Symmetry: C3
Subunit: 247 residues, 3 copies
């Protein structure tokens, strides 16, 4: 089994992230925690999720991987609230998924990990010009590029260190300017990258305010977003497809 | 006339209940209070409403029955709020309906009771295994069967006394378990019944939290729901069509 | 340039008013303030807006008129909140529009005032039977005529001084009765006028509660609505097409 009392609040954060990109979850429950990670069909979105130590009151595991009917758990798990603790009880078999929340017991027929889709790996990369900002201003920067230009610039190094999420389009443009001051941390390097704002939309559509956003900036490569979304108890790594940077 | 200062809050509760099932209201104003009650066209829903003593500051009556343009009063009466008192003034004629709320006077041409539809009667039944629960957990039990199975089980007597609103469907199921403790009252009997969750949906779609739900449980028969929805000033009796109980 | 720190709250009030009727804004920035005013295509709505002294912390002007891509500024300006101060910086050219809000700089290609549409003038009229009421009861009066009758009566002088927004329609009617008392001011005259409730809808769809509504009442003529929508810092003058007053 996988014994876990999970704070209710850790439920929508974990199972919603990949949603944007996959419906079916291959699930990995390892001895330190249980993680998640897949590429959407168009291969334009990869969010590696790693769930951490003591995020539930207890738990026991040894190997034990599951593909979950993510398309079904998605709304059923969301019918619950944060202030509750959750149980993950899956020792009987892999065809069912039992969960306990507010007196309600669930039984879901689960899929064998081996017949869904190949599971990705870690592009092994180390970028320079890494930035940080809170999710509220990061999504608000997205909301500004969400209609003028289609894709978002993360222009880094605008006269040595600087960031910019701007978008050029016919007869209208937009620039979000973000200096040092009151910007948690900086790594003042040289990289800037392009990305498609839409495939960013579905991604930060779930990130209101108070989530530290970390952007690994490099030149024209998949940008890495490192996150701890809830009380500071989780990560959601999003890589979006680059774009040629001319304009 | 029918002189009634009705607390605004008693307006949406009274005229919304049948809505789910009928558009046209045959209305009965008797000397203790004025009540309501009809079967939807598909004959899969009957909510007998009985309005009680002193729910308005005053009132006078002697016979006097009305069929109301329920399809029109429905949104006009809902344009008002609870914190107001309402007047029911209908002595001039039966072709109009005058009501007073916030300085706004209304005049509706009303229908003669005798040309709409037959008005039902009280199935005369006394069931065993009667249950009680608050509307918030009752609708929340409905929300759980609202997508896995189509109809809701009220399984009563799961090893002598017990209740369960579970729903079986291909490769996925669900069970809501409800013991004694912190369940206002019980009548520990033997009956369990099936019902269609949809025709329950429209019914408890209006019941958030804090409404005592009373379920007359028997075996495969129309279940009776007894209610006092607002400050504890009204009833809405819902009978939903049974279903064969195999599964 | 036009130097203006505008309270964020003055942004949605100013640019939303004409929206209901025009998409393209011919903009007039005069030495006391900058105003706005045009007739919708169907010529059934004219809202003359005049922005006043010190509504921004500072400003400089000399002539300088602009036609704005109102259809684009409309959602971009609304992506911001009230608690912010705004800058109107347009000295470089008339092809662009630069605005500053929360670190985000904007650049919009602007149109030359001379190629959009003729700009109206002030019907020069002085009516009698002028009324006043707060936007909350005025829109709530509109919400009552919004479904029974199509157009709203402003019947003035119902037995010397009185107001009424009533609407007659087949087998159903409605009347909103409004006396002296607790009705800020009156001018007890003789005029009553008709108007189309829809073209009033889009107009007071933006007026919740606490906005003084002033209705210049006369007989069958375009009614004038004088307003100060926000902390008491703006006007929106709406003239709606009369209607024959029979019924």
């Amino acid at each position: 089994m996988f014994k876990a009392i999970v704070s209710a609040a850790t439920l929508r954060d974990a199972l919603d992230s990949v949603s944007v990109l996959v419906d079916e979850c291959k699930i990995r429950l390892n001895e330190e925690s249980l993680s998640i990670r897949a590429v959407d069909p168009a291969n334009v979105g990869m969010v590696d999720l790693t769930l951490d130590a003591a995020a539930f009151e207890s738990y026991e595991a040894h190997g034990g991987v599951i593909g979950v009917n993510l398309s079904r758990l998605e709304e059923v798990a969301g019918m619950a609230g944060a202030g509750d603790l959750i149980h993950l009880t899956l020792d009987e078999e892999t065809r069912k998924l039992n969960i306990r929340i507010d007196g309600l017991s669930y039984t879901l027929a689960l899929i064998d990990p081996d017949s869904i889709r190949q599971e990705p790996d870690i592009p092994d990369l180390d970028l320079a010009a890494n930035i940080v900002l809170e999710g509220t201003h990061l999504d608000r920067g997205i909301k500004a590029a969400d209609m003028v230009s289609d894709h978002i610039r993360l222009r880094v190094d605008g006269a040595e260190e600087t960031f910019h999420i701007e978008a050029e389009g016919d007869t209208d443009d937009v620039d979000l300017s973000l200096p040092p001051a009151d910007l948690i941390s900086i790594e003042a390097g040289a990289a800037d990258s392009l990305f498609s704002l839409d495939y960013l939309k579905d991604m930060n559509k779930a990130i209101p305010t108070d989530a530290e956003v970390t952007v690994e900036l490099g030149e024209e490569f998949p940008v890495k977003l490192h996150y701890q979304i809830a009380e500071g108890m989780g990560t959601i790594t999003y890589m979006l497809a680059p774009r040629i940077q001319s304009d």
